[PDB]
Symmetry: C5
Subunit: 260 residues, 5 copies
Amino acid sequence: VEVLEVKTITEVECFLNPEMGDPDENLRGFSLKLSAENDFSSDSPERKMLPCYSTARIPLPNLNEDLGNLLMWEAVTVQTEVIGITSMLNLHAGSQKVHEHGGGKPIQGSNFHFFAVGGDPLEMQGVLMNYRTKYPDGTITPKNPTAQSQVMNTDHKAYLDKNNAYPVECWVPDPSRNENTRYFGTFTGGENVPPVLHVTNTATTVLLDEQGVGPLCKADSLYVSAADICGLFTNSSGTQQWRGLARYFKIRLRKRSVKN
Amino acid sequence: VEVLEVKTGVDAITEVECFLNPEMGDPDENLRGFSLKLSAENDFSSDSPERKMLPCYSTARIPLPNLNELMWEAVTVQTEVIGITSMLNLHAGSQKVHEHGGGKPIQGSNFHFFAVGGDPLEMQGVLMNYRTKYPDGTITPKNPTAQSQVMNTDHKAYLDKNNAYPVECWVPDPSRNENTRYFGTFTGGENVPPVLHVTNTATTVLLDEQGVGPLCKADSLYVSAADICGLFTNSSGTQQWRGLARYFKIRLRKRSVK
Amino acid sequence: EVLEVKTDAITEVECFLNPEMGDPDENLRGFSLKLSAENDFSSDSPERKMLPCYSTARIPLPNLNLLMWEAVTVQTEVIGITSMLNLHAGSQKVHEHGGGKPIQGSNFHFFAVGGDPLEMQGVLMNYRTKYPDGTITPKNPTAQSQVMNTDHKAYLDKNNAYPVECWVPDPSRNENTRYFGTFTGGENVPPVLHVTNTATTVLLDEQGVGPLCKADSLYVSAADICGLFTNSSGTQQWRGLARYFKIRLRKRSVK
Amino acid sequence: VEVLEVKTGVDAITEVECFLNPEMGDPDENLRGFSLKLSAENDFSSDSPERKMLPCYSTARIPLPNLNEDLTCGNLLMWEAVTVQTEVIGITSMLNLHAGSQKVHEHGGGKPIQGSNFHFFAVGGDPLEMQGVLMNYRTKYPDGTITPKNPTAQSQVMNTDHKAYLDKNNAYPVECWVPDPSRNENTRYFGTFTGGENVPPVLHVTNTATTVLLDEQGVGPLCKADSLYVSAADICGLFTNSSGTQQWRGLARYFKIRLRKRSVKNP
Amino acid sequence: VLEVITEVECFLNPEMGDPDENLRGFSLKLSAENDFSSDSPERKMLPCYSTARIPLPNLLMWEAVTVQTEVIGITSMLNLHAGSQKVHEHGGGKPIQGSNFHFFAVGGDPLEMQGVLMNYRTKYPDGTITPKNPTAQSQVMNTDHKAYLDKNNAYPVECWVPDPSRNENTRYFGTFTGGENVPPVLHVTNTATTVLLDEQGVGPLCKADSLYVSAADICGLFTNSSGTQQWRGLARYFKIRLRKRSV
């Protein structure tokens, strides 16, 4: 695409639900109880235990009254926020007491907060803790992995082209691709890591690259992608479940001239 | 409203201030600023918190000098939490950290939140457990389903009543609040240290990218807060939320609109 | 009504303000008395030497009479932070054969500069606390004293009298003072303290006007509770350190 | 490794992309990216770590296209490294708490990777220059490592004898070597060490972040003999097996380096 | 100071106590629980400030303009196989952690220090320079305790801080982080410069053609398998850019 001038503005928005595994009709936003200590040679996680990347396609009207200069929608900025962070102030429901006569144990531990906005589906690279993991039906995971899949195996290239299918533990945004997508992620690992989450409607991320060009909706589609694993919920029984929250996107779009 | 020039001249600027008291539950006439002791381990199917156990959002409407329906535009807010040094009382009520030790400081999950707008703060409901049975005198997501544990777009409310909207049920709605600025941080965990800053030299600019602050519909300014500071641990081991008041000083200017 | 800056018109004053942690005996200057624990709210009578108090000094300036001294910048630093590397004196072993336990836990680092005494707001953990003789604490407190009670207005007008647990800088006043404080609470919080002679705080407000020394007096105020010292026995004491101030002042014309 | 002519001619830009694999020890064919289980409590006098227990620096030399038709000319062209974008690849793999790791408590999930970590990269036109420092000068290092020669007690602080080039992949143990701030005129390096048993790994990914490699004079690393050097160490923490044994976990590092042609005086 | 280049460099060794010929960079094992009335620490237990006078080429004086500095050998703490207590059964060695202090100064005169003591009654050992005639006021601010950092391996870190009321001709920077379980966090990069010019663009001036560097880099406590603890310190590198200034 040869990018020309800006045509001299609309907003689109989405609340993207998290895909934590949802083990029954009442535990929407939670994973299945976590298993532990599986040998690498016999590691068969159940589908409902594995959080997956969330994604939605926002369709836009074509701008070309007549198909040398075309018009495409261009993403300029995004406002994004994790939705429901105060829900972790419920220490009365389900959580193990911190000590005798105490309140419930807060959600805490390993967390991952990630979003992307592009004119194409997110491009991902596969990396596994254990190349021998047997992944369950309904997941899409690195094909024909080897030991090299525990470091970098360039065979593992995927599109985030399906909601609730690509396990977060198997896939990362690919920095060698995503020419038409901007992505941002923080991983914080550990048993006792405190969740730290900020809300403000005053924060904007600018999506323009070094040349002042945002993601271009080449096929009149805008892609939003997220993963928001807030930490682990510890049941009275001792079992643990991932908890996730929805993510809001508001994307400012403008019309961009291009050659064709 | 189409937004035109800032009006300057005599009486084209005002400053209003307020202290918003916290609404932590106030379980008896002597424990203002605390919640009732926390229950733990309720099954999701049998979760009935008492009103006095549930911290709520604080909110107040500040009347502004009457303009002929020019609007008042909020430009800056100075805000801080009041009484942070009260947590240096380790002689009263708190469980000793060990034999012959001082009392356990307040610590654990905390939430620090404030909003300034020309409309009531617009909130979105999200629940830990959609089956929680909330008590009389609370306003909570109406007729929740399983999706209410993630995003259910039916749960929209105005923060239109003090000491009524539980903090655990509601967040500011980023899809609305065109005319409000809000700021919050949640830090969760049993051992989280409270970290609180005071200074009269720090100001938050409420102007958007176009240089426009909250516009005060009907000459009313809305302030909102939640300052849950952590958990107080009694000698028995029981725990109570502790909250503190928030101060607001808001500078406004007259703005022409069409 | 503040006119022009006069351009021998720039003075410096410096001060080392000692902490007031309670000083339970003549050897334990800079420490509090052993902390008590688990007093019922209905019977909470803390001893004076257990309560750290705000430090303050009034620095008299030459009477220029109008012209007034205007405070423009402050350089400030907590003094003796390396003393906490002494883990051989008095502190409880971390484990068998281990060194002493570091000072750690709740801390409060605060300073103010103005041309009037620091204006303070009262707030209490427990309104029913019975405070000892020699302390100045909220008068006629109620349950609302545990949140915001506008009755509790004080001037920091006596050194070693206003307990830190009772009083905060009042953001509704202090027109003629700049104040800065950080509270970090918790059982095991690490003290984190920086020293540099390269850091300056500007005291000018939005209109370029610093505190104005009313009656030719400059006011410095501080509280530097570093955390808790844990004795061998398990008893705990607050530890505090002195604060340095170097303040640049200029002559300002006023109507 | 991709070397791409993005733009040609006088204002030519070349982008070099590459994924540098970590060198954590790889104790068996299935545990690529992990070390051998850590030993503990070896007396200083009797400290003989096994090869596969010792994470090493990663490095590679990337040959660039020759720019000089005539080597006699008064001016010669050199590739100059202007910017780098870099991140650690596969950080979400640590959300697998079902494989191999000690349960946090009865009926709990696996223990996350955590503890001491080191994240480091360098981009230069010469091999990264390193200074040796040892915890224990009397350590006996295994065949296949390059470690400080004839160490003394002074090697536990600063011994200026211990100078090396990072000139071999999977050979220089991280615990023996640091980048040398007294040299590296033609390299830019960046590292953070975080020590402690329960240190949480904190890793950021974004394709929007760029590090500028220009010095105060506006000059990037100059690729001597058309050679670009990439170096990394990304020890993420310790993986704790159900037995309680611990292994270093490392991840690959991505580099995207932007280069332009600088004219230099022919020496 | 009237009208307005050379670079000097130094690797300054730490002075942690060096309890024997093999344990260079470590202190003697720490004592605990001494009564304030009987606290007599051994010299080899006490980390001291490091310092070096750097002689410079002889109405013109050398003005220090910038410093690059970093702590040398931080990756050496990734040796968890040697001497340290296992974190649990079958586990690796315990990382160096706990109270740390990282400090450096650049000046045209020796660093000026102020004495402050945890315990004024401490009896300090021969070979140390500590506050003279300490009183209870030495636990807070006692203006008697003034010293020059004029001897390497003599002034215990626990007794002395940089004096903010002097040091007209020195720039200094320190962070103290206290606590049993504090993680060391150390950064390396050759891309970082500290500018030593004051608000009027004047750097430290080297009177007597001498440049003074000072450091303390106590990284944390090393826990032996026995449970005994020792300070670990590391060297600091300095590269200082000077220019000629007319006086």
